[PDB]
Each structure stands twice: as C-alpha cells, then as structure tokens.
Design an enzyme around this catalytic site. Sequence first.
Site, short mmCIF file in Angstrom:
data_model
loop_
_atom_site.label_atom_id
_atom_site.label_comp_id
_atom_site.label_asym_id
_atom_site.label_seq_id
_atom_site.Cartn_x
_atom_site.Cartn_y
_atom_site.Cartn_z
N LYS A 46 0.74 -0.74 -0.17
CA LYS A 46 0.12 -0.17 -0.08
C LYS A 46 0.81 1.18 -0.15
O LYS A 46 0.26 2.61 -0.52
CB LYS A 46 -0.93 0.20 0.98
CG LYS A 46 -1.76 -1.16 1.41
CD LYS A 46 -2.26 -1.24 -0.10
CE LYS A 46 -3.49 -2.44 -0.37
NZ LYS A 46 -4.85 -2.04 -0.70
N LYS A 100 1.25 4.57 -4.92
CA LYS A 100 1.70 3.54 -5.56
C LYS A 100 2.29 3.65 -6.90
O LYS A 100 3.41 2.77 -6.72
CB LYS A 100 0.46 2.47 -5.67
CG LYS A 100 0.07 1.83 -4.18
CD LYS A 100 -1.39 1.89 -4.60
CE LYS A 100 -1.95 1.27 -3.21
NZ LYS A 100 -4.04 1.74 -2.81
N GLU A 108 -6.61 -2.25 -10.42
CA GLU A 108 -7.61 -2.03 -11.16
C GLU A 108 -8.08 -1.02 -10.99
O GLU A 108 -8.37 -0.08 -11.51
CB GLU A 108 -9.09 -3.34 -11.03
CG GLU A 108 -9.38 -2.79 -9.65
CD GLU A 108 -10.35 -3.99 -9.59
OE1 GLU A 108 -11.03 -4.46 -10.39
OE2 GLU A 108 -10.21 -4.66 -8.54
#
Lengths: 216, 217
Positions: A13, A73, A164
């Site tokens: 994360k 990220k 996604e």
Amino acid sequence: DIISVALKRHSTKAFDASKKLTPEQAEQIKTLLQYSPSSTNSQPWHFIVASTEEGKARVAKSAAGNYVFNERKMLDASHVVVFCAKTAMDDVWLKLVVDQEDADGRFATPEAKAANDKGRKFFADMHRKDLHDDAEWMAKQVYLNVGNFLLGVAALGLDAVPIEGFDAAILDAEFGLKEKGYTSLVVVPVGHHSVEDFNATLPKSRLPQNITLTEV
Amino acid sequence: MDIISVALKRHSTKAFDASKKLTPEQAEQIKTLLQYSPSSTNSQPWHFIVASTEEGKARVAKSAAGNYVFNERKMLDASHVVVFCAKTAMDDVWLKLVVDQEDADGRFATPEAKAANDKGRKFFADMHRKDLHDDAEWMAKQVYLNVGNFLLGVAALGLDAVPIEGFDAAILDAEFGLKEKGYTSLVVVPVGHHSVEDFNATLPKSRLPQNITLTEV
Ligand SMILES: Cc1cc2nc3c(=O)[nH]c(=O)nc-3n(C[C@H](O)[C@H](O)[C@H](O)COP(=O)(O)O)c2cc1C
Ligand SMILES: Cc1cc2nc3c(=O)[nH]c(=O)nc-3n(C[C@H](O)[C@H](O)[C@H](O)COP(=O)(O)O)c2cc1C
Ligand SMILES: NC(=O)N/N=C/c1ccc([N+](=O)[O-])o1
Ligand SMILES: NC(=O)N/N=C/c1ccc([N+](=O)[O-])o1
C-alpha cells in the site's frame, strides 16, 4: 518454498521511493511477463514497464478522480508494469505466433505447423467469429499473466500491488494504445514497501475451503 | 532452481501418467494455492472442484466431448484435476461474507475501518454489476488470475499441469449443478506427472520477442 511465498506475500500500500530493483531483478520481471502461458500461446498482450520518474508520472496520470489514492503507489515504486491486451484478434498476429513457434523449433514438419495453425484458429475463431468475445478472451490471458507475475515477483523477494483502480481511458490516451490495437487492464507497481505500508503486517484473509472448494 | 528457472522450464503437459499420484502433502499444497490467490477487492469470486477419485475425474472428463475429445485423456490420466469456476453474479451476501471473514481474521482495528473497507469494495463491485453490467466478466478475470498463480505454483512444487479451455462448460456445469449453485466453469487444470506420450515435455518453449511485446519508459 513457493507455498511460503504465497502465504507471505501481500498487496503493498506504500513504497519506499529510494529502493530500486537491481538490474538483475529488472531483467527477471521482464522474463516473467514474457514467459507466461496463454490460450494457444496467443500472447495477446503488450507491457509498458515504467522505471524513470517521467515514465512513472505518465502512468500515474491514470490515478485520477476517485482513483487518486492509488497515485502514490505508481509514483513511489521502482518499476511500474502496465498490462495491456489486444483489442481484436487479427490474422497477422496469429501468423506471427505460429512463425515464432517454428523459429523456436517446435515443428518437425510443415504438416505439424499447419495442424498447430489450424488448432489455434479453431479457438481464435470460436471467440472472434462465433461468440464475439475475443476482447474478453485476450483480456483473460492478460489476467492469467498478472497472476503468474504477482507470485513470481513475490518469489524474487519483491513487493508489488495489482491495480484496477485507474482510468484506462486516460492511460490508453497517454500512450496511444487504442490506435496501436491495445487497451490497458492492470497496473502493477513493483519495488520494496515502506513503513507506511500498513498491509505488510496485517494477516492474510481468505474464505474457508469448506465454502470455496469441493473434493470429488 | 529459482522462480525464473521454474518459468523457463514449466510446460503444458499433453499426457499424464495415471499411476503417479500427488502425495498427501502436495494435495494439501495445491488447495492452498487455490485459496490464497489474490483477487480484486479480495472478492474471491470463485469455486474449485478438485477431482481426485477415478469416478470424479471421469465425470469432469464428460466435458471433453465433440470437438474437445483430444483433451479427454489429460483429464482422466492426471492425479488431480481442478475445475476453476466463477460466480455468475456478484451478490451482496457474498460481499458481506468476504468482509466478515476479513474481520474474523483480524484485518480491521475498528468498526469504522471495516465499514471503509466494505464501502471501498462496493465501489468497485458496483461499477461492474451496476454501471457496466459486466460483473460476470470481471469475476472471470479474477479466476484467470488465480489460474496463472496456480500454474506457476504447481510447477514450483515440481508438478506437471496443463490449463484447458477446450471443454464443454455446459456439460461440466450440469455435471456438478454449478449454474443453480451460482457458478460456471472456466478452466480445467489436470495436475500430476507427465507420461511418455507427453510430446511437449522435450520441445523448446516459444515466446514472442520482447522487442514486440514490451516497451520501457
Ligand atoms: C485485479 C486486482 C486489482 C486490484 N486493485 C487494487 C487497487 O486498485 N488498489 C489496491 O490498493 N489494491 C488492489 N488490489 C489488491 C487486492 O485488494 C488484494 O489482492 C486482495 O485484498 C488480497 O490481498 P493480498 O493481495 O494482500 O493477498 C487488486 C487486486 C487484484 C487481484
Ligand atoms: C487458458 C488456457 C487454455 C488452454 N487450453 C488448452 C487446452 O485445452 N488443451 C491443451 O492441450 N493446452 C491448452 N493450453 C496450453 C497452451 O497451448 C500453452 O499454455 C501455450 O502453448 C504455452 O505453452 P506452455 O504452457 O508450455 O508454456 C491452454 C493454455 C491456457 C493459458
Ligand atoms: N487451447 C490451447 O491452447 N490448446 N489446445 C490444445 C488442444 C488439444 C486438444 C484440444 N481439444 O480441444 O480437444 O485442444
Ligand atoms: N480494488 C481493490 O482491490 N482495492 N482497491 C483499493 C484502492 C485503494 C485506493 C484505490 N483507488 O482506487 O484510489 O483503490
């Protein structure tokens, strides 16, 4: 062993932006992308591997609006892989694949090559001419590649997270993918997690096998 | 070997030795691989049939019919055969099941954390099942990701396998009452050890060159 890897890996994360892949690791991840299996060895895919600050910034443009909490990220990881699928299965690609298998010495005779081409076309035609789901069929192969990839990178001792939560229209436009015959499906930052990665120490959670698995 | 060795050495087995069974340890290991695959929002939108009896494999092999007859022996001859199934629709009971399981496992520090995770999961799930009406395909993609994880994993255990799309999913679904249970079969993966008839064991691997498929930026 590989089961230890499967049980210990996690979706990162937050990445440490100072920690880069070694040149060796950078080559290893490319090999994983390349060597994934696929239906008929159709390999209906393209990868963008962003490792420069400029390159990663371009990919991170896709982490817009409701996807903004994936942006860091993409920026902070060492190498960011964009997994893309072809948008339609065309004959030139089918020929490219069979010619490559021939170059690699998979066919003993011209007859064997022709039978392989015929079999590939059976499956390709089922999707692109009968069901009209070849876009989905190819996308499924790319997801299979992602699954291979996530386990492989974990086994190399690298952190990653599949994403996604990005705007594929933005990402496609940024790299001109549509006009080249591809569309972006999943973004996977790869590197090493930072102290801000709360998920590194949380327990894994899966549904029990008495729900998901039947032995017969 | 390292994992790259596994990737470079593994192959789709075309024929299995029906006398070479998984050990009890290996049989447990393959089930762990199926379970622990990641998925979008940890939605785990899947069911697995693991056929290890000769009776069970014969039933799965009913799906290798018509144009798919030349996959029949792979299904009969492998030690274990896994049918990968996806949910046919993403329902709210399942979404609750997943978040309640994450809670039981200790992923949430507070009730508010659990609610935020639930809200985030539904954001993604609703995009598919409500905006795009493509949740069936979204879930199938997670199953394919699981298959990719599985093929590499079983190869790293020193086991042979082959992914199979050449089967009649209508027959296979009916055989195990999948549709009425809320699932549909996508990929069949026999796992075991190859036989002398596995012509693919000694053939070179072939992939397109990276100058075609890969751009660095
Ligand atoms: C296809 C796919 C897409 C995902 N998208 C995101 C994402 O956009 N952002 C994120 O933080 N995690 C994303 N995840 C991570 C999942 O939430 C995670 O895989 C799941 O909760 C299981 O946990 P694990 O990966 O730590 O085993 C995604 C995972 C998959 C498989
Ligand atoms: C989703 C999928 C379905 C496939 N279906 C079959 C099949 O029905 N029968 C078969 O013999 N091989 C099948 N294959 C094997 C592929 O032809 C093979 O993966 C590809 O040629 C690459 O070779 P490799 O798996 O040896 O690396 C399938 C592979 C995938 C990924
Ligand atoms: N889909 C594939 O990659 N390869 N399929 C190979 C074969 C061999 C027999 C059959 N079959 O459908 O009977 O499919
Ligand atoms: N799709 C997932 O599994 N999990 N997504 C997590 C997150 C976190 C931030 C975002 N985002 O879309 O900005 O998605």
